[PDB]
Design a binder for this molecule. Structure first.
Ligand SMILES: Cn1cc(-c2cccc(CNC(=O)c3cc(Br)ccc3O)c2)cn1
Ligand SMILES: [Zn+2]
Length: 352
């Protein structure tokens, strides 16, 4: 019962891997921004999260949409959790580079994005290469969106980097011990964490774990040799892709109505990792069973909607589906749309 899903996955692979000029234009724009931000007072230590990560695609069906993160190290941060939210923080700290954005003791996000935008917006017109336009949008995080020629779109996010221990709200998160092992959990928690602005009180930051995500997905098996042959070839990644593509196509289909705007691939990745924890054996992700495995994910995700519970994978107490974050009517609307796709072997896939 995998025939149609395979074809979808094959189609999606061929537009990933198709020779494109997009990545090359993105790199020239980002490198110019970085060299101009580096010789500025507040952004001296700015750098790319990964080198060779100019081509990060949040939208797995939109290959001209890139999402790039610019990191910045903040030594000796003092975090203060906002209003018991477990996940949103004030940043405090004595003539650090970021002192020009203080508000008493508290790091201002909107001020830092103000100058970040203005610095970039200044270097954008200084670009003599190609057609680069930026655009003020109310999202605000993804902060600065650039458009390169017509099709290519780049979202640039600014993150603070901390090489200290992860904040306490994550202590019981990342419950990978029965799947990736307790020792990998240690190694991962020894990596730095990142803060991005919220998009409430205005100057809060939340944690970003996109780098931990990338790391799990590139080494995702209980078996160390998972996906290194076709001997133990598994379908975890393919299931994540179909979850992502399912929500994207639904968001696209119902973009006129307003009900799916609060959902993102972040809700889908989060539910997916919970199912990995629930099903830690590679045998439970055999590629022969692509159709069943996908169904597990779809089923679990729909359970989350109906109960209004989807705990953050890194922060156990933070409920992404709390009605204060996404109300009952929206979750009930997504629920019924997916139940319909599923009960009809997903017609949103045979259409592009
Ligand atoms: C798009 N969007 C995200 C948040 C958000 C809010 C509050 C706290 C967090 C913590 N991050 C994660 O759970 C996370 C999980 C995975 Br899988 C990969 C990366 C991640 O950053 C995120 C809000 N909108
Ligand atoms: Zn695998």
């Amino acid at each position: 019962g995998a025939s149609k899903l395979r074809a979808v996955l094959e189609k999606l692979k061929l537009s990933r891997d198709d020779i494109s000029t997009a990545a090359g234009m993105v790199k020239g724009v980002v490198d110019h921004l970085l060299l101009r931000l580096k010789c500025d007072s507040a952004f001296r230590g700015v750098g790319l999260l990964n080198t060779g990560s100019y081509y990060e695609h949040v939208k797995i069906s939109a290959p001209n949409e890139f999402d790039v993160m610019f990191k910045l190290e903040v030594p000796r941060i003092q975090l203060e959790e906002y209003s018991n939210t477990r996940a949103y923080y004030f940043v405090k700290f004595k003539e650090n580079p970021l002192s020009q954005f203080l508000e008493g003791e508290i790091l201002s996000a909107s001020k830092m994005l103000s100058k970040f935008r203005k610095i970039i917006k200044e270097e954008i017109n200084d670009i003599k290469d190609t057609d680069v336009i930026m655009k003020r949008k109310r999202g605000g995080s993804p902060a600065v969106t650039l458009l390169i020629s017509e099709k290519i779109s780049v979202d640039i996010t600014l993150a603070l980097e901390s090489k200290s221990s992860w904040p306490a709200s994550t202590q019981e998160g990342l419950r990978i011990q029965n799947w990736l092992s307790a020792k990998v959990r240690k190694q991962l928690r020894l990596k730095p964490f990142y803060l991005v602005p919220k998009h409430f009180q205005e100057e809060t930051w939340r944690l970003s774990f996109s780098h931990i995500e990338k790391e799990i997905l590139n080494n995702h098996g209980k078996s160390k040799t998972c996906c290194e042959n076709k001997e133990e070839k598994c379908c975890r990644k393919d299931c994540l892709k179909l979850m992502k593509y399912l929500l994207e196509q639904l968001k696209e289909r119902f973009k006129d109505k307003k009900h799916l705007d609060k959902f993102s691939s972040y809700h889908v990745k989060t539910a997916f990792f919970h199912v990995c924890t629930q099903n830690p054996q590679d045998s439970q992700w055999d590629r022969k069973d692509l159709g069943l495995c996908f169904d597990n994910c779809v089923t679990y995700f729909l359970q989350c909607l109906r109960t209004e519970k989807l705990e953050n994978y890194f922060i156990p107490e933070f409920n992404l589906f709390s009605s204060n974050l996404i109300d009952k009517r929206s979750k009930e609307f997504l629920t019924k749309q997916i139940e319909y796709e599923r009960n009809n072997e997903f017609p949103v896939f045979d259409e592009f």
